[PDB]
Amino acid sequence: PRNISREESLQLEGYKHACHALLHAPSQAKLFDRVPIRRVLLMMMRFDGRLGFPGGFVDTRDISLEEGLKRELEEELGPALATVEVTEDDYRSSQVREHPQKCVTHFYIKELKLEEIERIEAEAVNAKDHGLEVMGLIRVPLYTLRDRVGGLPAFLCNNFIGNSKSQLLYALRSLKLLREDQIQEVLKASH
Template identity: 75%
Template structure:
């Protein structure tokens, strides 16, 4: 079983089950490649703009075997987008086939921490994520150097030491 996700700059989605994740899905027998399957899923979940923005082999970042909830391999892709492209995706996502069914909406990942040490990225990391989406998010932030390592470490620590 092959499964893939896309990391687009700093955007995730709220899923139908209330968990955060990346757009993606299963490879279908009609898909000629991982990238074809991913582009099909992006079109279904994020809308028609992905007819012009194609994910390619160059966007591949990593793979991870998983045992639960079912055996499979998750392939992680990252595509850097311009702010205008991200805004277009956010607007057109409402017309996506799966909007309101699988995808409840898009969410921008805060790439900052507020002065209180918790607001922003640390609070975001305390949310409920599907599968290995949280580890993939952190991997993407690190490898794309979107956030300095010490800020990532502080955010992880703060998200695990919440005091309500």
Template identity: 70%
Template sequence: MAAVRRAGPNPGSEPGPEYKRACHVLLHAPSPHKVFGRVPVRHVVLMQMRFDGRLGFPGGFVDPRDSSLEEGLNRELAEEMGLGVGVARVTENDYISSWVMEHPQKIVGYFYAKRLSLEQLEQLEAGALSAKEHGLEVMGLVRVPLYTLRDGVGGLPAFLRNNFIGNAKEQLLEALGSLGLVPQNKLQEAVQASRE
């Protein structure tokens, strides 16, 4: 995969119409909670278990009839997470990065991140059970543990050993660092521990 960046809402030089467009979003919220009353959660980040058993982010392919990338992403979110997704409406300002894939099919992907309140995020989680694609395309939402337990393996290192779709794992790590959800040194330690 070759990475392509766009500086704002209007991509400059972008692959042609033979490429499908896909948009995904990392939804996150600050959290004051502690696991077992002692391990700070700090932030909640949502991913989903997909129909193929892999972890990925909410979103999907943009329909050519969608008026914009963000409109396509918001339509996908409504299908996958239910009607309460209005609180998480994604805009051009939530854009983070783009990527291009040539094989097995031609796809240009767009990645977004949206900060919510913990209450909004919990509303989304509850509403996702009644979403159109729940139990079909999406098997359920998953909270990413952003901490490492005392054993050095539990938490984020163990989570990173899962099977992710496409470049979702790389997108997760990039976003956790760039958004400051996990300190860079702790993120590097978790990645290293996940490989051991």
């Protein structure tokens, strides 16, 4: 609920802040040699059985949003994230809420080279959080299959830690991956 500015969200007192990031990379691959993958988007299965974007809570009195994100990404995704600088330019949006708890979440979006994502996936099994906070990394299917369900629509029927779905739908729009009509279709096909 509510799109707040970064600058205004940061000026608030007694709010709990969170940072999450969509890491992505272009791909020339085709599923079954016919269906283009287009782009690789990382999400993860969380300890709580829900899908989410990597990241977490940041205490903005101690460290910066970016520094907090950085530290959270390393724990969740592993060493490979020491070559990766998610900076202010990667920042995208911020939502604020007061119930259940005064919470602001920030959303980042960073493009990488395909092999970087691959190095990340290869090394995520060595992350401090593997098999604990993080139950596994997954790629988001951007395609719809011949049955009009399989792929993205079906994927959106999984269980998402509150708000991550909306962030994802935001990112599909912002990266020009899907038209508004296409997103609407994907949501109907899902239901």
